[PDB]
């Protein structure tokens, strides 16, 4: 269909002016990784960029960063024309020059720093007019090239004399400035980022179609998550990047006004925004306006929760407006806000995980120029519990520490503090570890939901259980119509039972990982909390959170916990049923047909579990998890030692021999007991620094087995008795 | 880097006009515990103080109390110039004289008490203009030395005839009065005192930098503790000592 045009799409690399083509296009465009290519754009303008070769991209989507797009005036999903330019011709000092307000308090010589490092080792091709952006010294300043000695475009060479100027030509009115947040400023919430963009792509990008079609596009979207997880960030990025007019209501501003000065700004906020359409109204802190409940007193509060309901109703789909509202927990707001036609979509931004806390950290230091040893992987490992704002606060406190150890050491403080001096400034690992030492996990801790990092590589033995579990959890999600051929419902429960420390937890996490599914762990103390606190209404919030995190594995560990707290060898006079397990029964059997929520219980006392859990439509598959065998006891010892260094001198299958049986936990005990005797040696020294066989022999002096061969027979009994 | 300048920092002793140097500096400045030293300060003014020798201080930080700093116009973290003055020359009755409102209901003869005990056993060196402060009888009254018979500075000796006056010259508008609380008025909360000063040092002391840098300085701080533990005290001291405008809701 005249394959010249191509779509624009996001790109992974940090560098500017690099487009990443789909590899089965090589000889079509005929141009390799050494050829720069001209790209057509809106208001009659272009750019030229060197090309990279990668597998994962789609065929039709060019991958390029924000700066190369803004000048093109392409917004993601737009199409550009890609035509080669082998005809490239080098320049002699293209003239480059500072812009915006960015251009903040800088002074002196910014060219040996904000240019010369960047142009070097590069040959970065530059067409006159590009905004190409540089970063250093806790700031991103971009230099627009106003003049190119040859034209239109030029490679840069190390041999072009370089022109010191530094004058502040103000940015033109019509371009929308770069400082503003795009999608690449959002680190760690991306699964849901596709979700919001999917909802809003067609309404915001294509106003014509919904006037040319019968259908209803989403009227309002409810972003919810703990505070500081980037909900405002998301709304702004989506608005800024689609180009739609972003209006911002925040609850306390509306609540700041007097009665009738309030709802006027509110009903003006939409009657102002529906002009500028397509537009996004972001109502964050929707709890401030709209907790319509028992708890509000007064008419004027109840008035404002009203009229918000009827501005939601008032948009007739001739409004191109999308309404986003940020909330913290969903029960927070008035339930009539969720009527269909007000806030129909509900999207949970959630706490970022270790794998996500990395990207956030890497977004909030892109201007710093760090120090070489800090790896941001273990920085991202000990920041657990931090939302993305906690993370932004960490690295800014890191950078204010390092500015405390240096600089004003001399007291160089002048009118405008020097450029080259902050670029020298670097922040080492001893700053960040000092940044964490502060209170910063002052944000929320509630039930986590993320893909665990335990692959099957971590579980010694249990081969048959590993394949049994895959069938239970995998085959239904992958191959449904096969289940439909025999008219079968996949069983959605499992109950692991066996002695303690045999890996019932590991297996559950391992299988969530193999599915790349979310894993919610409800541990024993949390069920006991509901049972003492007589609050089993919490079990509903647990399953609805699995439903929103689906596909997920929901794991009840120590499901016998409440049965124990009642005794159970003699125990109370009652039956097996109790408050909390009752609500687990209720919420299980009353759950949605298949949302890919798979329920795993685990127990070390299958004896005293109530049998109602067992009935079909519940945890329906009992899987015994035995004490390991020396076959497995070898892989248990290795999967523990696959991190810490273990010299060849100490040998395994002989340790794994001497134990008639231990738990996989008793073996980790031995391992960790040995590794303690080692570090004891290494800290002391020197006044050698690795593990040794005699470390493990002193460890084995304390090796105890927690399972007494009595109850294995008891466990052996529950096995054949049940079938 | 032209090691003349040095930073100002807090000091443990109760007495006035004593700066406590870092001991591995002895022969650099070449001056021992028997030499008085001239220190440069803002709006073209100085002071001279005898020196003490201690281990725990940093190398770059002079340790001196509030009174010796206020006239210097140095606020902690500022830098002053330290140059020796073995050339010291004694005075004959520097003229000293009461100031502020402090100067409250006092009367009769305050010189046998608010001066003569303090000058004694001392040789306290005094440059014309110093505010050096004395305490007695449930009040702290400070006497500014308006006139020095030789100049600029003088040791005091027990042999200088002493001038009874006691007149209330009102304090000049531009100096920020001593009665106001500093860090040394806060006794027992100090671990967190370093914490608040760490948070607020760079934003309050260096307004230029956060305009010259991308970053966000702390917007608000929440002091909490049982009532009467000095939370207002802390906020005022930090404000008064960095010099920033303190508003109180
Ligand atoms: N996922 C994220 N990626 C990058 N930055 C984030 C993320 N989440 C939060 N932040 C940072 O946290 C700060 C607070 O974000 P904001 O959206 O105001 O919080 P909330 O989510 O409560 O609305 C923002 O300045 C943003 O830079
Ligand atoms: N079969 C095993 N293979 C590897 N490690 C194990 C095994 N069993 C136990 N462990 C180690 O012991 C710890 C406790 O095991 P856990 O998963 O709690 O089992 P359970 O739930 O049966 O008590 C885990 O951290 C795990 O690393
Ligand atoms: N750590 C302290 N050191 C010295 N004085 C203190 C201290 N804490 C309290 N005070 C005294 O207690 C009085 C009450 O202090 P104030 O700051 O008003 O109380 P709060 O801490 O409730 O704000 C102040 O006059 C102050 O002199």
Swiss-Prot record, chain A:
Mutagenesis or variant effect for residue 66 to A: Strongly increased affinity for ATP. Strongly reduced affinity for ADP
Places the protein is found: Cytoplasm, Cytosol; Endoplasmic reticulum; Nucleus; Cytoplasm, Stress granule
Documented effect of changing residue 135 to H: In FTDALS6 and IBMPFD1; properly assembles into a hexameric structure; cultured cells expressing the mutant protein show a marked general increase in the level of ubiquitin-conjugated proteins and impaired protein degradation through the endoplasmic reticulum-associated degradation (ERAD) pathway; shows strongly reduced affinity for ADP and increased affinity for ATP; shows normal ATPase activity according to PubMed:16321991 while according to PubMed:25878907 and PubMed:25125609 shows increased ATPase activity; no defect in ubiquitin-dependent protein degradation by the proteasome; impaired autophagic function; defective maturation of ubiquitin-containing autophagosomes; decreased interaction with CAV1 and UBXN6; decreased endosome to lysosome transport via multivesicular body sorting pathway of CAV1; decreases the arsenite-induced stress granules (SGs) clearance process
Impact after mutating residue 178 to W: In IBMPFD1; increased ATPase activity; impaired autophagic function
In-chain residues carrying the UniProt-annotated modification N6-succinyllysine: 648
UniProt: ATP 2 binding residues: 501-506
Outcome recorded upon mutating residue 163 to W: Severely reduced binding to DERL1
A molecular function (GO) term: ATP binding
Outcome after substituting residue 139 to H: In IBMPFD1; without frontotemporal dementia; abolishes enhancement of K-295 methylation by ASPSCR1
Binding residues for ATP 1: 227-233, 328, 364
PANTHER family linked: AAA-FAMILY ATPASE, TRANSITIONAL ENDOPLASMIC RETICULUM ATPASE
Family that this chain belongs to: Belongs to the AAA ATPase family.
Protein name as annotated: Transitional endoplasmic reticulum ATPase
Protein species of origin: Homo sapiens (Human)
From Swiss-Prot, chain B:
Residue numbers binding ATP 1: 227-233
Consequence of changing residue 106 to F: In IBMPFD1; uncertain significance
Residues with Phosphoserine modification: 17
Primary role: Necessary for the fragmentation of Golgi stacks during mitosis and for their reassembly after mitosis. Involved in the formation of the transitional endoplasmic reticulum (tER). The transfer of membranes from the endoplasmic reticulum to the Golgi apparatus occurs via 50-70 nm transition vesicles which derive from part-rough, part-smooth transitional elements of the endoplasmic reticulum (tER). Vesicle budding from the tER is an ATP-dependent process.
Disorder this protein is connected to according to its UniProt record: Inclusion body myopathy with early-onset Paget disease with or without frontotemporal dementia 1: An autosomal dominant disease characterized by disabling muscle weakness clinically resembling to limb girdle muscular dystrophy, osteolytic bone lesions consistent with Paget disease, and premature frontotemporal dementia. Clinical features show incomplete penetrance. Frontotemporal dementia and/or amyotrophic lateral sclerosis 6: A neurodegenerative disorder characterized by frontotemporal dementia and/or amyotrophic lateral sclerosis in affected individuals. There is high intrafamilial variation. Frontotemporal dementia (FTD) is characterized by frontal and temporal lobe atrophy associated with neuronal loss, gliosis, and dementia. Patients exhibit progressive changes in social, behavioral, and/or language function.
Impact reported for residue 135 to C: In IBMPFD1; also in one patient without evidence of Paget disease of the bone
Native organism: Homo sapiens
Effect noted on mutating residue 111 to R: Severely reduced binding to DERL1
Name of the protein in its database record: Transitional endoplasmic reticulum ATPase
Documented effect of changing residue 163 to W: Severely reduced binding to DERL1
Similarity comment: Belongs to the AAA ATPase family.
Impact reported for residue 135 to H: In FTDALS6 and IBMPFD1; properly assembles into a hexameric structure; cultured cells expressing the mutant protein show a marked general increase in the level of ubiquitin-conjugated proteins and impaired protein degradation through the endoplasmic reticulum-associated degradation (ERAD) pathway; shows strongly reduced affinity for ADP and increased affinity for ATP; shows normal ATPase activity according to PubMed:16321991 while according to PubMed:25878907 and PubMed:25125609 shows increased ATPase activity; no defect in ubiquitin-dependent protein degradation by the proteasome; impaired autophagic function; defective maturation of ubiquitin-containing autophagosomes; decreased interaction with CAV1 and UBXN6; decreased endosome to lysosome transport via multivesicular body sorting pathway of CAV1; decreases the arsenite-induced stress granules (SGs) clearance process
Recorded superkingdom: Eukaryota
Effect of residue 159 to R: No effect on binding to DERL1
Range of the intact protein held here: 21 to 269 of 806
Coiled coil segments of this chain: none
